[PDB]
């Protein structure tokens, strides 16, 4: 085990990938939420191209 | 300098009339005798402005010429612009 | 952001369709920050094997 990599939300490796609308609500996520950002120390970070 | 040969404008520059009505109103605002009859005036700036038009203000202005000398003009001798 | 050179800021004909002409910040950042057009898709890359 070398380390831990921050995971972009709704990528193929998030827990929210492939979930439907009903399941995203039980997990208290917005279905309209585009995704593509990171959670570092609770803040939501956006890598800028 | 002598009272003769004074070379300066007889008029009161708007800088002198700004510091005369300020310095006079600060005196009036501390128990200072008032030269002019005041009628319904509780405000010092209005009193000091009134003393000026009547030429009652007791101040002499010392004007430094640029070469180091000076002249002493009393506020009556000067001519009020406004 | 400091530089007063206006060549990097100006809108360039090659930005047709891949970058939004109107959307851009103002102040010192004028034209240095650029939004993307709707259809534009950045390419993820591959191997030329």
């Amino acid at each position: 085990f070398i380390g831990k990599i921050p995971i972009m939300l709704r990528s193929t490796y998030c827990l929210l990938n492939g979930l439907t609308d009903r399941d995203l609500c039980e997990l208290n996520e917005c279905p309209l939420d585009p995704g593509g950002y990171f959670i570092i120390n609770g803040s939501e970070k956006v890598l800028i191209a | 300098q002598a009272n003769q040969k004074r070379i300066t404008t007889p008029y009161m520059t708007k800088y002198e009339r700004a510091r005369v009505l300020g310095t006079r109103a600060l005196q009036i605002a501390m128990c200072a005798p008032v030269m002019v009859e005041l009628e319904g005036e509780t405000d010092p700036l209005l009193i000091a402005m009134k003393e000026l038009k009547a030429r009652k203000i007791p101040i002499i202005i010392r004007r430094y010429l640029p070469d180091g000398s000076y002249e002493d003009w009393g506020v009556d001798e000067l001519i009020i612009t406004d | 952001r400091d530089g007063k050179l206006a060549k990097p800021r100006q809108l360039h004909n090659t930005l047709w369709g891949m970058v939004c002409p109107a959307e851009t910040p103002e102040g010192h950042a004028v034209g240095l920050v650029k939004n993307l057009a709707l259809m534009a898709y950045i390419s993820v890359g591959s191997q030329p094997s």
Binding site: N28, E29, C30, P31, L32, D33 | - | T14, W16, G17, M18, V19, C20, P21, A22, E23, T24, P25, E26, N35, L36, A37, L38, M39, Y41, S43
Partner: protein
């Protein structure tokens, strides 16, 4: 036409964009390959105009209004405005109070504005459907006179109706969030939450 009939029914056909790209109908073209291409704005330019500008058009664009970003796609009639005025709206479209995310009751964020009564516009770009701006609209329609009335609206100011503002018009909520963290720092030094 047979391609469009299949996309029209796209639901439950398992037939979508990738099956459109795989038929050679659409093509991705980056910039420096746009130097070797002839584009037609619309299929109109392809028909014979009797005076041939170009007979060679090698690609047609899907729609001309997709050249605009996400914040400049909300402007109605953007081609009718002086050009800095679509740039300013791009700056003021990001500052608008509206419902930002639908789960906001769960989220704890410093500085969350929200607005009681959003409304989807009455004059709406046809690409707002793909910005999901009917779901999370930020704004309200309003009846707008353009008149010099009492002089209070001069310069860039606006006069408002106070009977409207009493009914919930542009009446919003401002959430502010605080956090404090108990900790153990010194050997004997502890912090505790307690009523002093």
């Amino acid at each position: 036409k047979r391609h469009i009939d299949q996309l029209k029914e796209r639901e439950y056909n398992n037939y979508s964009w990738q099956d459109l790209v795989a038929s050679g109908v659409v093509e991705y073209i980056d910039t420096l390959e746009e130097e070797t291409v002839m584009l037609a704005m619309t299929p109109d330019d392809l028909q014979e105009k009797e005076v041939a500008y170009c007979s060679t058009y090698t690609h047609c664009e899907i729609h001309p209004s997709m050249i605009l970003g996400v914040c400049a796609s909300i402007i109605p009639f953007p081609d009718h405005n002086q050009s800095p005025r679509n740039t300013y709206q791009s700056a003021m479209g990001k500052q608008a109070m509206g419902v930002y995310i639908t789960n906001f009751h769960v989220r704890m964020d410093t500085l969350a504005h929200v607005l009681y009564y959003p409304q989807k516009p009455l004059v709406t770009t046809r690409s707002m459907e793909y910005l999901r701006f009917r779901e999370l609209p930020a704004g309200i329609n309003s009846i707008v006179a353009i008149a010099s009335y009492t002089g209070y609206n001069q310069e860039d100011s606006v006069i408002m109706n106070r009977s409207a503002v009493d009914r919930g018009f542009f009446r919003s909520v401002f959430y502010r969030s605080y956090k404090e963290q108990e900790s153990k720092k010194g050997f004997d030094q502890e912090e505790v939450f307690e009523k002093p």
